Design a protein around this ligand. Structure first.
Ligand SMILES: COc1ccc(CCc2nc3cc(-c4c(C)noc4C)ccn3c2NC2CCCCC2)cc1Cl
Length: 115
């Protein structure tokens, strides 16, 4: 099944917007983790493939997804990176858990509509 870039954008960008709408939970995710700025040199030792909302948005805007499960994969890579690196008591970790609940609800009917 072929998917057009604008078809993927029209279907999937509302689910990304739903994540941006989460406040405070989306705030640490709207831009890439910056280890130099945050003083965490070990970050890229642990997270070999960073992902964040702005990079997913750019990938959707520049047609880098050929199928919707590639978009889902990048959202879940965001989540898994954050659960992996951050302590379970931290804001980032608990915010990640909230985004995953939101995303699960938003993406389900959209994947049905795509087929
Ligand atoms: C309201 O929320 C917060 C407010 C302040 C803080 C401390 C500063 C801070 N700590 C992180 C951690 C990650 C991260 C992720 C994600 N995965 O691993 C790591 C590591 C990313 C950004 N951080 C930032 N910068 C801020 C976030 C908020 C908007 C502007 C930039 C924490 C949070 Cl929660």
């Amino acid at each position: 099944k072929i998917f057009k870039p604008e078809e993927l954008r029209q279907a999937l960008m509302p689910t990304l917007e739903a994540l941006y709408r989460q406040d405070p939970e989306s705030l640490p995710f709207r831009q890439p983790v910056d280890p130099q700025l945050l003083g965490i040199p070990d970050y890229f030792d642990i997270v070999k493939n960073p992902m964040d909302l702005s990079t997913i948005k750019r990938k959707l805007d520049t047609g880098q997804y050929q199928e919707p499960w590639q978009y889902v994969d990048d959202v879940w890579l965001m989540f898994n990176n954050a659960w992996l690196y951050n302590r379970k008591t931290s804001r980032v970790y608990k915010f990640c858990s909230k985004l995953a609940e939101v995303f699960e609800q938003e993406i389900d009917p959209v994947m049905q509509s795509l087929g």
